[PDB]
RNA sequence: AUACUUACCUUAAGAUAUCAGAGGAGAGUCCUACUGAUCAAACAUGCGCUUCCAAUAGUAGAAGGACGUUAAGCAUUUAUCAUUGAACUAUAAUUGUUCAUUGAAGUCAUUGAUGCAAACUCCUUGGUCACACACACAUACGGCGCGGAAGGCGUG
RNA sequence: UCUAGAAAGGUAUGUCUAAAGU
């Protein structure tokens, strides 16, 4: 059956699986961590997020703004 | 609502499942084919001649 | 463009031939990967040290915001008149002219006619029981008939029959006005 | 208060829409611009095209488009190691608000 | 408002060009009112390298949706 | 709604013990019969118990690995059984309506006059008059030619092709009621 | 399970840091309030273009569409 | 050409607009429809551009001649996100008095059409 | 407050609209649409040279300024002069108001005043 | 809501050869199967020109509606009924 | 035309110019074939208002095109990489150089593409009107014929 | 506690029934 995208994001939330979030292309950073929550706008909150460029810094618990996500992969 | 301009018949709340079923209705297809045959026939059959600019 | 997916008979889809395909001419702008507004937008803490002083020494005091104070004037008017209406509205055991006998016997009738008389108001109210006192209310600033009155019946069961009868029937037909009736409410 | 923030915006009525806008200006993030409109302090705006402006705010709006006065634009330009600083004075100005980044309030 | 008409493209392989430059292939499973899509077994067509066991593409950055399968 | 973020908000808010009357357990097992017939002409109204997706995917997890709660099965079987027996009564009413057409009075007297007209070469005359009476019964059929769809109870016909039948059999009514009959056959085999 | 709107309601009067998406210019300070569109006023703010503190800003207002991540700070 | 000062885009139907867009392209075509989002329907439009090579000739310092690529497109509809400005170029094929005559004649024909349709469906 | 209802009151006033590209439009303002679609009558389109020797102007806006068609050709700088331009709303960065106008009568919002008074 | 003449005209061209250029530069051209209300189109048996010119072929494509720059419908839809200015609708239901 | 069967579906809210005054209906609202001013539209009707409207006393001419020809015009500039073999300058994923295998994908075009200039041919458009074949002008030029197209401004 | 009566159509579809000669 059809698995809607908010259901897949909530699945990623509920099994606490580590995701990797691709941002806009000319920004140049990807963020890796576990999704804790979201809204209807696809803005997400991540716990123990580590950004990497294209070994990277730790960020703590960020609110990634949902205007900027391209792709959320596990 | 919706209104089939070719058909000349109204319709209730414009849902794509009603509208798409109208747009492949056999009677709508006859009305549309008549409309476009007549409009192509009118633009072929219309002899518009250039205005005459008679010099002395 | 030889065999058609269109429902119309091949006759009708000879009419809907497109134009020939569009010629290819190379693009003149930035591709979709490289499209961005300018990054390297520099900071703003540079401005606050030097250039802010060169702004303030040129324009030391700002212009008056007069449309703002027109809004301020209407807001002071609303607040002030609310305070005065509250003061005069708050300040019935010290109204004398409503200080007759027990209150359940006193019926309130309002929207009474402007040119009416206390005698014909008495004749109307007496039909539902004996009245003890009447007092039509007049404006204390100038004695325009206020259109409301106080009618004291001898008993509260007699008073509530006048309310029932002459109040629920659309208004007691007095002179040329319909005066609805209820309890004293004070 | 809580009743207008908690609900979605399509369930409010018209008096609650206007009450919500007044609440959002008076107790919110645009209260910075409102305090600078009343208290006459100069603001420093960094537009998106790397022009910084410095002005006073005569009026604002829910979109952050604003009518300024005594505008002093300040931008920098360069091609390589050559670099200059430029300045333009505009008297009265309407700024379409989709280009703003950071409104600042001078101490 | 109006769901996109991707009832034909369900459970098939699909090649979509993310954001201009990039290009991703995968097995489509779900979609929403905005065109954000969720596709199983995503492999970024470049020597190509695979993304992960599930992805969810925000539909702001889909340009076209080519269907590799029969449909 | 009108803006798409409003509808998206509606969906995520309805996404975000597990017992009691608050949750329609019949939907929780699957395919609530007041949900499968919402818009159609056999509409029951609204499902009284609320439906919610967080509970449903928690049930998907629970019957994936945890356990099964058979009180949910017996409640669903009660609701399913009362609806299926009610529509069995209604298809009985529909074929009763075919019978009541078939035993109509003036048609029975007309076929009685033609069957008294049916009364070697005597057999050839009787067979010609009986084929005329067979065509009279078929003329009564050509007024109707109705069979009854055995699942949904609605009328059908055989003179019609397979394709307009295929137009019928992918309905909201017929797919919903096929799903009801299939869960009833499954639960009556499994409980017996 | 914390959504973004209660997260940002929880960060009021705490030292947070937003990151503008342009030049990695992050601003950090004490968040006074938030909007429904996630406009955010800060207070006692600092900026960092690339770890280069150009100064301390008094009161800033950072527009909704610009901010890339908002993060809590120790 | 001179266009009336109070003439919005609703009034310029059947003019020959010259719609600029976000890329330097220009669609010289006859307007016949528009919308709330301002996405026009141009009748016979000709998408022009100035190439990357001849763009040096426009750079600030007889006349200057630029060779543009006229590419004929028949009955486009535009997407309104792209439009940047519209400039009127040419007046219509008809006058104003002739459009008045033709509009009264079309409305008369429509009212006769609805009269016959009503009196036919009542019969 | 919606501040476009301020811009509707400026009629027949010369403004100098800065666009998002960089090109500035100078003409008689006219009926402004509710989404800020400005209509200017007698415009003098121009595109400012960057006033550094090595630097470049906007290429897209330069080709656009030629393809308005009415570029007065023999002049040196990118100045095109035409009548009736119709600027789409989302492309105007800032509008330089005339100096002579009285803001203290223009910025009085009638609908806001009505909504504060009637409630 | 209401759609107006351009999106309704795009709905009038379901079935015929259209030619559309996306905002990334590409040009697709085929029979238009299903358009939608947000100019979200499908196209069958298309001839797909990449931006630098390399033309390929692909069976169906579903562009996002937001990426379209123009759509070139056939010529005869100039005579479509929705362009008629003085229309006389009979009666509501 | 009539009848029955089945499928699909059953509606975002509010308003119709503003300001101001007078009057009235139980502080604000509502109303006035009430009154002024402002704005807007239509219809008329005007300006010594501005711009434009093609030879026959000749075989011409203006504006716009050609997705027309000369024309393979004249001048430039391009045509995939790897693994190896034989040799090989050589920081590279033997790059450079000749020949081959194998391997990725691979718009066509090289009579092309880009720049420059000319000539010839062919389309579409209009008052091809009326009077005249003439000695004007510093306040530079009777703008003092009938119309038509487009805009400006004023009144009813 | 302030009195619950759900629509009635539209389009699409097949089949029956029928109306025509020279
Ligand atoms: Zn129709
Ligand atoms: Zn249920
Ligand atoms: Zn059935």
- HEC profile of I17-78: EEECCCCEEEEEECCCCCCCCCEEEEEEEECCCCCCCCCCCCHHHHHHHHHCCCECCCCCCC
Work out the number of other CB atoms within 10 angstroms of the CB of residue H29: 25
Say which ligand is closest to the CA of F178. 3
What contacts D73, CB < 8 A, 6 or more positions away? Answer: D51, D52, D53, D87, D88, D89, D90
Residue B25 backbone class (left: φ over 0; alpha: ψ -120 to 50; beta: rest): beta
> Count of residues for chain A?
74
Token digits of residue J78: 């100039």
Q: Which phi and psi angles does D106 have, rounded to 5°? A: -65, 135
* Domains (range + CATH), chain G: 1-74 (2.30.30.100)
Judged by CB atoms closer than 8 Å, whether chains meet at G4 and A60 is answered as no
CA torsion sign for G21, I88, E20, H25 is: negative
- How far does Cα C140 stand from its chain's mean position? 29
- Residues H23 and C28 sit within 8 Å (Cβ to Cβ): yes
∠ CA G23-G29-G31, nearest 5°, is 110
- On chain I, the residues whose CB falls within 8 A of the CB of C78 are 117
Q: Is I74 exposed, middle or buried (0-12, 13-18, 19+ CB in 10 A)?
A: exposed
Query: Smallest Cβ distance to J62: which of E2, E20, E64?
Result: E64
Q: Are residues H20 and H36 in the same domain?
A: yes
Q: Which residues contact D45 (CB under 8 A, 6 or more apart)?
A: D52, D53, D54, D55, D95, D100, D102, D103, D104
Q: Are H86 and H115 contained in the same domain?
A: no
Using CB atoms, pick whichever of C41, C42, C44 lies closest to residue G57: C44
Domain map of chain I by residue range?
A: 1-119
- Surrounding ion ligand 2 within 5 Å at CB are F 24, 27, 32, 47
| Domain ranges for chain E | 1-71
SS3 per-residue string spanning F88-118: HHHHHHHHHHHHHHHCCHHHHHHHHHHHHCC
- What's phi and psi for D31, nearest 5 deg? -65, -20
Give the CA distances from residue I32 to residues C85, G28, I11, in Å, rounded to whole numbers and listed in that order: 44, 40, 9
Subunit contact G56:C45, Cβ cutoff 8 A = yes
Residue H107: domain span: 92-123
Please tell me which residue of chain C has the smallest CA distance to A27. C39
What's C133's domain CATH number?
3.30.70.330
- DSSP 8-state class, residue J79: G
| Inter-chain touch I85–H18, beta carbons under 8 Å | no
Contact list, F2 vs chain E (CB under 8 Å): 1
**The two structure tokens encoding residue C166:** 């002459």
Separation CA A19–CA D96 (nearest Å)? 39
Torsion angle, alpha carbons of J21, J27, J30, J34, to 10:
-40
User: Closest by alpha carbon to H71, among H24, H26, H31?
Assistant: H26
For the CA atoms of F70, F75, F79, F82, what is the dihedral angle to 10 degrees?
A: 90
**Beta-ladder partners of A36:** none
Contact E54 A73 (CB under 8 A): yes
Q: Are E9 and E67 in contact (CB under 8 A)?
A: yes
- The DSSP output letter for J77 is G
Residues 6+ apart with CB under 8 A from E64: E16, E17, J22, J26, J28, J61, J62, J63, J64, J67
Label residue C148 exposed, middle or buried (CB < 10 Å: 0-12, 13-18, 19+).
Answer: middle
| Same-domain status, H33 and H76 | yes
* Residue in chain A lying closest to F5 (CA): A40
Instruction: Calculate the angstrom distance between C1' of K129 and CA of H14.
Output: 30
Rounded to a whole number of angstroms, the CA Rg of chain F reads 26
Flag if J18 and C8 touch (Cβ within 8 Å). Answer: no
CB H47 within 8 A of CB H25: yes
Domain A1-74 is in which class?
mainly beta
Q: Give the span between the Cα atoms of A12 and E54, in whole angstroms.
A: 9
Quick one: tokens of H6? 């109070």
Are residues J5 and J83 in contact, defined by beta-carbon separation less than 8 angstroms?
A: yes
Burial (CB count <10 Å: 0-12, 13-18, 19+), residue C128: buried
Query: What's the distance, Cα to Cα, between the start and end of chain C in Å?
Result: 90
Ligand 2: distance of its center to the CA of F29 in Å? 10
Residue C35 to residue C53: CA distance in whole angstroms: 38
Chain D interface with G: residues with Cβ < 8 Å:
5, 9, 24, 27-33, 64, 100-107
**Integer angstrom CA distances of residue H27 from C54, G28, H31, H72, J47:** 48, 48, 10, 9, 24
Residues H99, H62, single domain; the answer is no
Q: Chains with 3 or more CB pairs closer than 8 angstroms to F?
A: A, D, E
Residues of chain C contacting D, Cβ within 8 Å = 37-38, 40-42, 44, 47-48, 51-52, 55-56, 59, 61-63, 65, 67-68
Residue F165, both tokens: 């039948």
For I105, list phi and psi in degrees, rounded to 5.
-110, -25
Residues with Cβ within 8 Å of H25's Cβ and at least 6 positions away in sequence, in order, are C28, H47, H48, H49, I67
The distance (Å) linking the CA of D22 with the C1' of K39 is 31
Q: Residue A68's Cα: distance from chain center in Å?
A: 10
For the domain spanning E1-71, the CATH number is 2.30.30.100
Residues 6+ apart with CB under 8 A from A30: A20, A21, A22, A23, A51, A52, A54
| Distance (Å, whole) CA F127 – CA F141 | 20
- Spell out a b/e string for J23-45, using b for 16 or more CB atoms within 10 Å of the CB, else e: bbbbbbbbbbbbbbbbbbbbbee
DSSP-assigned beta bridge partners for residue E37: E31, E57
Resolution of the structure in the document, Å: 3.6
What are the beta bridge partners of residue F40?
none
Report CA dihedral (F40, F41, F47, F48) to the nearest 10 degrees.
160
Packing angle, helices F70-102 and F121-144, rounded to 10 = 130
Expressed in angstroms, the distance from the first to the final Cα of chain J is 19
Nearest CA to C27 out of H24, D41, B47, A63 is that of: H24
Q: Hey, what domains does chain J have and what are their CATH numbers?
A: 1-93 (2.30.30.100)
Distance from CA of F55 to the nearest CA of D (A): 24
Q: Are D51 and D99 in contact (CB under 8 A)?
A: no
Separation of alpha carbons C98 and F177, rounded Å: 75
Cβ(G46)–Cβ(G27) under 8 Å? yes
Report the number of secondary-structure helices (H) and strands (E) in chain G. 1, 8
Nearest to J86 among H40, H106, H118 (CB): H106
- Distance of alpha carbon H91 from alpha carbon H15, whole angstroms: 5
For strand K, give the nucleotides within 7 A of a protein CB. Answer: 4-12, 18-19, 26-29, 40-41, 43, 54-56, 65-67, 106-108, 114-117, 124-130, 148-153
Tokens 């596709």 map to which residue?
Answer: E39
The experimental technique used to determine this model is: cryo-EM
Long-range contacts of range F178-182, CB-CB < 8 Å, 24 or more positions apart? F178/F151, F179/F31, F179/F36, F180/F31, F180/F33, F180/F36, F180/F80, F180/F83, F180/F84, F181/F84, F181/F151
Q: Which residues of C touch A26 (CB under 8 A)?
A: 33-34, 36, 39
Rounded CA–C1' distance between B22 and K126, in angstroms: 50
Sign of CA dihedral A4, A9, A15, A18: positive
Domain that holds residue C168: 103-182
- The span from the CA of H39 to the CA of J69, in Å, is 10
Q: Is H71 helix (H, G, I), strand (E, B) or coil?
A: strand
Distance in angstroms between the alpha carbons of the first and the last residue of chain E: 25
User: Do the Cβ atoms of C74 and I60 come within 8 Å?
Assistant: no
Q: Are A70 and E58 in contact (CB under 8 A)?
A: yes
């Amino acid at each position: 059956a059809m698995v809607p995208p908010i259901n897949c994001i909530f699945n990623f939330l509920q099994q606490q699986t580590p995701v990797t979030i691709w941002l806009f292309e000319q920004i140049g950073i990807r963020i890796k961590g576990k999704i804790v929550g979201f809204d209807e706008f696809m803005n997400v909150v991540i716990d123990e997020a580590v950004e990497i460029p294209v070994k990277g810094t730790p960020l703590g618990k960020i609110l990634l703004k949902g205007d900027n996500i391209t792709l959320i992969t596990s | 609502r919706y209104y089939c301009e070719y058909c000349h018949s109204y319709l209730t709340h414009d849902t794509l499942s009603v509208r798409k079923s109208h747009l492949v209705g056999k009677n709508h297809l006859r009305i549309t084919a008549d409309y476009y045959r007549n409009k192509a026939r009118d633009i072929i059959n219309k002899h518009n001649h250039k205005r005459r600019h008679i010099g002395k | 463009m030889n065999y058609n997916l269109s429902k119309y008979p091949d006759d009708v889809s000879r009419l809907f031939k497109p134009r020939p395909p569009l010629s290819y001419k190379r693009p003149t702008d930035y591709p979709y990967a490289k499209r961005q507004t300018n990054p390297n937008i520099t900071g703003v803490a540079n401005l606050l040290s030097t250039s802010l002083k060169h702004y303030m020494e040129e324009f030391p005091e700002g212009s008056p915001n007069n449309h703002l104070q027109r809004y301020e004037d209407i807001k002071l008017s609303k607040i002030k008149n609310a305070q005065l209406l509250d003061r005069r509205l708050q300040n019935p055991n010290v109204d004398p002219h409503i200080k007759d006998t027990d209150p359940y016997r006193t019926i309130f009738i309002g929207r009474l006619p402007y040119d009416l008389d206390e005698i014909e108001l008495q004749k109307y109210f007496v039909k539902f029981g004996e009245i003890e006192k009447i007092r039509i209310v007049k404006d204390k600033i100038t004695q325009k008939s206020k259109g409301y009155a106080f009618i004291v019946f001898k008993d509260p069961i007699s008073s509530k029959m006048a309310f029932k009868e002459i109040g629920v029937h659309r208004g007691i037909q007095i002179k040329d006005r319909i005066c609805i009736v209820d309890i004293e409410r004070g | 208060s809580s009743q207008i923030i908690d609900r979605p915006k399509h369930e409010l009525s018209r008096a609650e829409l206007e009450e919500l806008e007044e609440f959002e200006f008076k107790h919110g993030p645009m209260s910075l611009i409102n305090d600078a409109m009343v208290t006459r302090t100069p603001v420093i705006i960094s537009l998106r095209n790397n022009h910084k402006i410095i002005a006073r705010v005569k009026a604002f709006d829910r979109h952050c488009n604003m009518v300024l006065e005594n505008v002093k634009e300040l931008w920098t330009e360069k091609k390589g190691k050559n670099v200059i600083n430029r300045e333009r004075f505009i008297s009265k100005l309407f700024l379409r608000g989709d280009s703003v980044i950071v409104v600042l309030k001078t101490p | 408002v109006s769901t996109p008409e991707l009832k034909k493209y369900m459970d098939k392989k699909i090649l979509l060009n993310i954001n201009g430059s990039r290009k991703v292939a995968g097995i489509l499973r779900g979609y929403d009112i905005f065109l954000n899509v969720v596709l199983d077994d995503a492999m970024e067509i470049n020597n190509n390298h695979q993304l992960g066991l599930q992805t969810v593409i925000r539909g702001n950055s889909i340009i076209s949706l080519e269907a590799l399968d029969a449909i | 709604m009108s803006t798409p973020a409003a509808e998206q908000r509606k969906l995520v808010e309805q996404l975000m013990g597990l017992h009691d009357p608050k949750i329609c357990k019949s939907y929780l097992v699957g395919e609530c019969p007041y949900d499968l017939f919402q818009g159609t002409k056999q509409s029951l109204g609204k499902c009284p118990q609320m439906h919610l997706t967080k509970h449903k995917i928690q049930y998907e997890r629970e019957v994936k690995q945890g356990k099964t709660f058979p009180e949910f099965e017996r409640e669903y079987l009660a609701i399913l059984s009362r609806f299926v027996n009610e529509c069995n009564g209604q298809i009985s009413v529909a074929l009763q309506n075919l019978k009541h057409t078939a035993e109509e009075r003036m048609k029975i007297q007309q076929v009685t006059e033609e069957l008294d007209v049916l009364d070697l070469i005597s057999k050839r005359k009787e067979v010609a008059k009986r084929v005329r009476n067979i065509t009279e019964n078929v003329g009564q059929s050509a007024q109707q030619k109705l069979q009854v769809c055995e699942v949904c109870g609605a009328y059908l016909s055989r003179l019609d092709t397979d394709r307009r039948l295929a137009d019928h059999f992918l309905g909201k009514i017929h797919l919903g009621y096929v799903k009801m009959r299939e869960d009833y056959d499954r639960l009556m085999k499994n409980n017996r | 399970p914390v959504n973004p709107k209660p997260f940002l309601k929880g960060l009021v009067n705490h030292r947070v840091g937003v990151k503008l998406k342009f030049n990695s210019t992050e601003y950090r300070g004490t968040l006074v309030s938030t909007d429904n569109y996630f406009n955010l006023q800060l207070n006692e703010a600092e900026e960092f273009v690339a770890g280069v503190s150009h100064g301390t800003l008094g009161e800033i207002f950072i527009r909704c569409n610009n901010v890339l991540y908002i993060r809590e700070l120790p | 050409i001179q266009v009336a000062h109070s003439s919005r885009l609703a009034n310029l139907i059947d003019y020959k607009l010259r719609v600029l867009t976000q890329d330097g392209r220009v669609y010289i075509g006859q307007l016949m429809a528009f919308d709330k989002h301002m996405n026009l329907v141009l009748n016979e439009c000709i998408e022009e551009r100035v190439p990357k090579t001849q763009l040096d000739k426009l750079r600030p310092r007889t006349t200057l001649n630029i060779k543009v690529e006229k590419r004929v497109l028949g009955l486009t509809i535009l997407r309104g996100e792209q439009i940047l400005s519209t400039v009127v170029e040419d007046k219509p094929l008809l006058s104003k008095k002739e459009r008045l005559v033709r509009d009264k004649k079309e409305k008369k024909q429509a009212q006769k059409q609805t009269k016959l349709r009503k009196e036919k469906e009542k019969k | 407050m919606k501040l476009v209802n301020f811009l509707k009151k400026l009629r027949n006033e010369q403004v100098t609209i800065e666009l998002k590209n960089g090109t500035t439009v100078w003409g008689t303002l006219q009926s402004v649409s509710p989404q800020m679609n400005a209509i200017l009558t007698d415009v003098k389109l121009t595109l400012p040279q960057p006033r550094l020797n090595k630097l470049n102007s906007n290429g897209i806006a330069m080709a656009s300024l030629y393809l308005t068609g009415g570029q007065q050709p023999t002049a040196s700088d990118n100045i095109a002069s035409l009548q009736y331009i119709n600027i789409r709303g989302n492309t105007i960065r800032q509008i330089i108001l005339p100096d002579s106008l009285n803001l203290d009568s223009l910025l009085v919002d009638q609908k806001q005043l009505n909504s504060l008074r009637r409630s | 809501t209401m759609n107006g003449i351009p999106v309704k005209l795009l709905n009038e061209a379901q079935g015929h050869i259209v030619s559309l250029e996306l905002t990334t530069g590409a040009t697709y051209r085929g029979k238009l199967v299903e358009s939608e209300d947000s100019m979200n189109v499908q196209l069958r048996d298309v001839i797909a020109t990449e931006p630098q010119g390399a033309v390929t072929h692909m069976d169906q494509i579903f562009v996002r509606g937001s990426q379209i720059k123009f759509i070139v419908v056939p010529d005869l839809l100039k005579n479509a009924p929705l362009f008629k200015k003085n229309s006389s609708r009979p009666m509501p239901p």
